């Protein structure tokens, strides 16, 4: 008698869903998900270029392993009523019984399934909320086009107790610094993690804590992510990330503080007449900014906004989607705008006469401007 | 749209 | 030239109701535009193959007309803050000022705008909720392919105070009977209204309180009006022939089954996950229970048994899962009554509210306001 | 799928 177990629907469907998120639409076995009963519980595993493993509680009548369709299983478990789920492997098929429902799923040979990679030594751990918020912050600025793979990752730099996360699409740079518990100290390394997979692992708020695995004194070629009984590993990118510490300005010629939500909605309103959503123009004066977009053939939009402004007036244009992306990623009520010139990038940070210094904040969104 | 690098 | 001022809510509501009946396309310079008219209130007009007019109150500083992009105007008005909106026509451009916002929109030639048809005399009026419920009920079964225009409409039959709505795609027939307030005789007429336009006008903000249909009196040609809350839309009637649907309804059923709608819908959704290209779901009716099955051994097999109140000989019948769930959802009742003759003949779905009741021999078809008749699939 | 008419 092969694997037989019984467990609740919610845990089963959530685990199978979390593992199935990383399964792309190369081999039939690659499209399958692995169920393994053990005395500890039930394990759901999947592997492509990134692995996902979920350990949940279950009543194991008989132990064993089986291989079933990942997408199909996630659909079934998602669409099942909330009842104890009884899974029993019969020969080459799986009998899944939940309430009044009974499913017969065909199986694939378990021997033909690859062995999952072992997670490296634990480098450190940080709260799950901080991880999800930070990765969601920096991931928005990474490149989404695989044509430039150097931009498609998130740069993870670890110096001792301090961790820095950076990503850039060449048009915007998002950097987030945070503190974590590192074991052991004096670890200094930097790697490039693919942005999409890290963003999926973050979007991982348990609660409790998330553990990242590199290996302490040299870094492996893989990154582990662990917590809430869930383990995922991604292969690191071998490309080179540009130096982002030089691109950040030390001091600004003009600084402007505004309200994030008001500015975001204003950009949404003014950008409706923009040509192919090209750009939104900002005219900064004392106490007020003027948002403008579009041309005379489609339409012209104009809005004046209250600003706390310092320095000489300047006119600068941005991509409306990039600017709203930064403002949204700030996750604060007010925004601090650094400005040097209209061709130089602008510094966005969450919130007399001469130039003003850049305040030190954990998150920073650096956005390049557009021509006029 | 200008480039950072 | 045209200058007016009105609140954002009324302006956006009128422009929204008119824009909900406008399909699309950019240029198309005249047909993609919307017409704003100051008179003495404000009129917002649009036309595609159906017209939409919304009259709202406004302060008209100077009267006139202007033509602007419909999609652009609906986007602006939807995204504006809630403030008095000031529209002033300057030359060939329109100046829209709401609060801190200022828009300069180019204009399209007003001389090229068509004259909208006048709605016919009022045939009758019915509550807006009943109109939306009925049109949403029968519209789901209408044909979506213009190649057979006889199936793309909704048959509207009016006998006095009673109105019947029917539509069929050849695979399912939805008929809804209702009572309304008629202002005619003895109003006897039958028309075929394009389903898409009637469904759009129903799903929109037409009311208000009651919906008024314009034909208007004693049949009629060539258009059907829909009026309320200062909003008027007219559709051109289809000249095609609707099949006789009163003959297609079976008089008596060999087997009848009453079930729970939600339970059955969730069961169909669950078993249909293994169906081949979502082809069909099999229903095996036995005493006290039905068995839903789908899929093959190559993909997977799904099976679920549901509690049924059943009468007659056991029979196995298959349906399209999307059509069956469409009917069950359109019933808008807690329980469903299934008529069955054979497995090749259609099944009758009728609403059952929460509580209700020959043996071997046949059972008659009960008279209900709504009925969903669905054809089966080969086993 | 059978037809009504």
Q: Walk me through the domains of chain C, giving residue ranges and CATH numbers.
A: 1-120 (3.10.150.10), 121-248 (3.10.150.10), 249-379 (3.10.150.10)
Q: DSSP secondary-structure letter at A346? A: E
Q: Testing the interface with A: which of C102, C107, C265 to mutate, by most A Cβ within 10 A? A: C102
Report how far residue C235's alpha carbon sits from residue C226's, in angstroms, rounded to the nearest whole number: 9
Chain CA centroid to CA C281, Å: 27
The alpha carbon of D4 is separated from its chain's Cα centroid by a whole number of angstroms, namely: 4
Residue whose pair of structure tokens reads 């048809």 in the numeric block = C117
Phi, psi of A287 (to 5 degrees): 80, -10
Diameter of chain C measured on Cα atoms: 81
Burial of C112 (0-12, 13-18, 19+ CB in 10 A): exposed
Instruction: Give the Cα separation of A361 and C193 in Å (integer).
Output: 64
First to last CA, chain C: 69
A226/A32 Cα distance (integer angstroms): 22
For residue A344, give both structure tokens: 């130089």
Find the residue in B nearest to A280 (Cα): B1
Residue found by looking up tokens 């492997």 in the block: A89
> Is the distance from CB of C249 to CB of C168 less than 8 angstroms?
no
C-alpha span between C108 and C92 (Å, rounded): 8
Number of H helices, E strands in chain D: 0, 0
Going by the DSSP 8-state scheme, the letter that residue A370 receives in this structure is: B
Residue of C313, C122, C331 whose CA lies nearest to C226? C122
HSE of A164 in the Cβ direction (CA atoms, 13 Å)? 17
* Mutation target among A150, A171, A321 for the B interface, most CBs of B within 10 A: A171
Half-sphere exposure of C318 (CA within 13 A, CB side): 16
Q: Shortest CA distance to C72 belongs to which of C108, C100, C99, C120? A: C108
Radius of gyration for the alpha carbons in chain C, expressed in angstroms and rounded: 25
d(CA D5, CA C169): 10
Residue-level length of chain B? 5
Interface probe, candidates C375, C376, C377, chain D, greatest D C-beta count within 10 A = C375
Q: Following DSSP, what letter does each residue of A1-59 receive, concatenated?
A: ---EEEE-HHHHHHHHHHHHTT-----TGGGEEEEEEETTEEEEEEESSEEEEEEE--E
Helix (H, G, I), strand (E, B) or coil at A78: helix
Rounded CA-CA distance A207/C356 in Å is 50
Peptide bond into C322 cis (omega under 30): no
Q: Kind of pairing, strands A251-252 and C289-294? A: unpaired
In this structure, what token pair is assigned to residue C191? Answer: 């028309």
User: Is A340 touching B (CB cutoff 8 A)?
Assistant: no
How far apart CA C299 and CA C296 sit, in angstroms, is 6
Please say whether the beta carbons of A331 and A225 come within 8 A. Answer: no
Contact A368 B4 (CB under 8 A): yes
Query: Of C350, C364, C44, whose CA–CA distance to C205 is shortest?
Result: C44
Instruction: Decide: A78 and A64 in contact? Cβ < 8 Å.
Output: no
H-only helix segments in A59-148: 70-79, 128-139
Query: Cα-flanking dihedrals φ and ψ of residue C13, to 5°?
Result: -70, -45
CA dist C125 to C121, C138, C185, C210, C317, Å?
12, 18, 14, 6, 41
What is the token pair recorded at C237? 């009637």
User: Do A166 and A154 meet the contact criterion of CB atoms below 8 Å apart?
Assistant: yes
Tally the residues of chain A.
372
Please answer whether residues C283 and C296 qualify as being in contact, where contact means their C-beta atoms are separated by less than 8 angstroms.
Answer: no
Calpha distance A282→A293 (Å, rounded): 9
Helix/strand/coil for A324: helix
Rounded to a whole number of angstroms, the distance from the CA of C376 to the nearest CA of chain A is 23
**Nearest CB neighbour to A103, from listed C69, C104, C302:** C302
Which long-range contacts link A114-119 to residues 24+ away (Cβ below 8 Å)? A114/A29, A114/A47, A116/A45, A116/A47, A116/A51, A116/A53, A117/A51, A117/A222, A117/A233, A119/A213, A119/A222, A119/A224, A119/A226, A119/A231, A119/A233
User: What phi and psi, each to the nearest 5 degrees, are found at residue C204?
Assistant: -95, -170
A263 lies within 8 A of chain C by CB? no
Strand order of the sheet with strand A300-306?
A314-318, A280-285, A288-293, A300-306, C101-106, C93-98, C85-90, C3-6, C59-62
Torsion, Cα of C311, C315, C320, C326 (10° steps) = 0
A171 alpha carbon, distance to own chain's centre:
18
The alpha carbons of chain D give a radius of gyration, in whole angstroms, of 5
Quick one: resolution in A?
A: 3.1
Rounded to the nearest 5°, which phi and psi values hold at A87?
-110, 125
User: Measured between alpha carbons, how far is A310 from C334 in angstroms, rounded to an integer?
Assistant: 65
C54 vs A240: CA distance, rounded Å: 60
Q: Cα separation of A225 and A50, whole Å?
A: 11
Q: Cis omega before residue C374 (within 30°)?
A: no
Token pair for residue C65? 């007309």
Q: Is A345 on the interface with B (CB under 8 A)?
A: yes
What's the rounded Cα separation, in Å, for the pair C374 and C352? 17
> Contact C17/C206 with Cβ under 8 angstroms?
yes
Closest CA to C366 of C324, C335, C338, C345: C338
**In whole angstroms, what is the distance from residue A40 CA to residue A42 CA?**
7
Query: For residues C115 and C131, what is the distance between their CA atoms, to the nearest angstrom?
Result: 28
Inter-residue contact A337 to A326 (CB < 8 Å): no
Q: Which of A313, A307, A314 is closest to A256 using CA atoms? A: A307
CB contact under 8 A, D3 and C375: yes
Could you tell me if A8 and A59 are in contact, meaning their C-beta atoms sit under 8 angstroms apart? no
Cis upstream peptide for C43 (omega within 30°):
no
Tell me which DSSP letter residue A199 carries. H
Say how far apart CA A222 and CA A229 lie, in whole Å: 19
In this structure, the dihedral spanned by the alpha carbons of residues A314, A315, A321 and A326, taken in order and rounded to 10 degrees, is 0
The dihedrals phi and psi of A238, each to the nearest 5 degrees, come to -90, 5
Q: Which two tokens stand for residue C162?
A: 């009673």
Dihedral sign computed on CA atoms, order A110, A111, A112, A118: positive
* Residue C228, CB-side half-sphere exposure with 13 Å CA sphere: 20
Radius of gyration of chain B (CA): 5
Phi/psi of residue A199, each to 5°? -65, -35
- CB count within 10 Å of CB A57 equals 12
Q: How many other β-carbons are positioned within 10 Å of the β-carbon of residue C181? A: 11
Q: In whole angstroms, what is the distance from residue A59 CA to residue A68 CA?
A: 20
Which run of H or E residues covers position A163?
strand A162-168
H, E, C per residue of A226-276: EECCEEEEEECECCCCCCCCCCCCCEECEEEEEEHHHHHHHHHHHHHHCHH
Spatial strand order in the sheet of C301-307: A59-62, A4-7, A85-90, A93-98, A101-106, C301-307, C289-294, C281-286, C315-319
Q: How far is CA C268 from CA A85, C172, C190, C274, C365, in A?
A: 19, 18, 37, 11, 25
A81 close to C (CB below 8 A): yes
Compute how many other C-beta atoms are within 10 angstroms of the C-beta atom of residue A143.
19
Q: What tokens does A196 get?
A: 């999409």
- Determine contact, residues C144/C169, Cβ cutoff 8 Å: yes
Question: How near does any CA of chain B get to the CA of A312, in Å?
Answer: 23
CA A113 vs CA A45, A46, A66, A220, C214: distances in Å: 10, 10, 10, 24, 69
Please, after which residues is chain C broken with C–N above 2.5 Å? 40, 218, 357
Closest-CA residue to A88 (of A53, A54, A63): A63
**Which H or E element spans position A196?**
helix A195-202
Distance CA A51, CA A282 (A): 46
User: In this complex, do C248 and D1 lie within 8 Å of one another by their Cβ atoms?
Assistant: no
Experimental method: X-ray
- Check residue A343 and report its DSSP letter: S
Rounded CA-CA distance A256/C84 in Å is 30
Q: How close does chain B come to A263, measured CA to CA in Å?
A: 21
Per the CB < 8 Å rule, is A297 touching C79? no
DSSP A147: T
The secondary structure of chain C, three-state, reads CCEEEECHHHHHHHHHHHHHCCCCCCCCCCCCEEEEEECCCEEEEEECCEEEEEEECCEEEECEEEEEEHHHHHHHHHHCCCCCEEEEEECCEEEEEECCEEEEEECCCCCCCCCCCCCCCEEEEEEHHHHHHHHHHHHCCCCCCCCCCCCCEEEEEEECCEEEEEEECCCEEEEEEEECEECCCCCEEEEEEEHHHHHHHHHCCCCCCEEEEECCCCCCCCEEEEEECCEEEEEECCCCCCCCCCCCCCCEECEEEEEEHHHHHHHHHHHHHHCHHHCCEEEEEECCEEEEEECCCCCCEEEEEEECEEECCCEEEEECHHHHHHHHHHHCCCEEEEEECCCCCCEEEEEECCCCCCCCCCEECCCCCEEEEECCECC
Cis bond leading into C186, ω under 30°?
A: yes
């Amino acid at each position: 008698t092969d694997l037989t177990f019984r467990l609740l629907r919610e845990s089963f469907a959530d685990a199978v869903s979390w593992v199935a998120k990383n399964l792309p639409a190369a081999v039939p076995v690659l499209s399958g998900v692995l169920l393994t009963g053990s005395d500890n519980g039930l394990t759901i595993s999947g592997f492509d270029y990134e692995v996902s493993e979920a350990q949940v509680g279950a009543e194991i009548v008989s132990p064993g392993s089986v291989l079933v369709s990942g997408r199909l299983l996630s659909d079934i478990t998602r669409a099942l009523p909330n009842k104890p789920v009884d899974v029993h492997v019969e020969g080459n098929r799986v009998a899944l019984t939940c309430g009044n429902a009974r499913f017969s799923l065909p199986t694939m040979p378990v021997e033909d399934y690859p062995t999952l990679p072992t997670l490296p030594e634990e480098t450190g751990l940080l709260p799950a909320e901080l991880f999800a918020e930070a990765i969601s912050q920096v991931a928005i600025a990474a490149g989404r086009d695989d044509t430039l793979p150097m931009l498609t990752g998130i740069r993870v730099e670890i110096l001792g107790e301090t961790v820095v996360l950076a990503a850039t699409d060449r048009f915007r740079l998002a950097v987030r610094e945070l503190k974590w518990s590192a074991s052991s100290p004096d670890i200094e390394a930097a790697v490039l993690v693919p942005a999409k997979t890290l963003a999926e692992a973050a979007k991982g708020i348990g609660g409790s804590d998330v553990r990242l695995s590199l290996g302490t004194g040299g870094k492996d070629g893989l990154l582990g992510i662990s917590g809430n009984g869930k383990r995922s590993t991604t292969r690191l990118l071998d490309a080179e990330f540009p130096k982002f510490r030089q691109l950040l300005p030390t001091e600004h010629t003009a600084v402007a503080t505004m309200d994030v939500a008001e500015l975001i909605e204003a950009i949404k309103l003014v950008a409706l007449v923009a040509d192919r959503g090209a750009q939104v123009r900002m005219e900064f004066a004392d106490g007020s900014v003027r948002l403008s977009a579009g041309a005379d053939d489609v339409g012209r939009a104009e809005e004046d906004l209250v600003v706390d402004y310092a320095g000489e007036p300047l006119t600068i244009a941005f991509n409306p989607t990039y600017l709203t992306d930064g403002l949204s990623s700030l996750r604060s009520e007010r925004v601090s705008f650094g400005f040097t010139t209209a061709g130089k990038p602008a510094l966005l940070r969450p919130v007399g006469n001469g130039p003003f210094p850049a305040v030190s904040t954990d998150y920073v969104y650096l956005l390049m401007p557009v021509r006029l | 749209q200008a480039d950072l690098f």
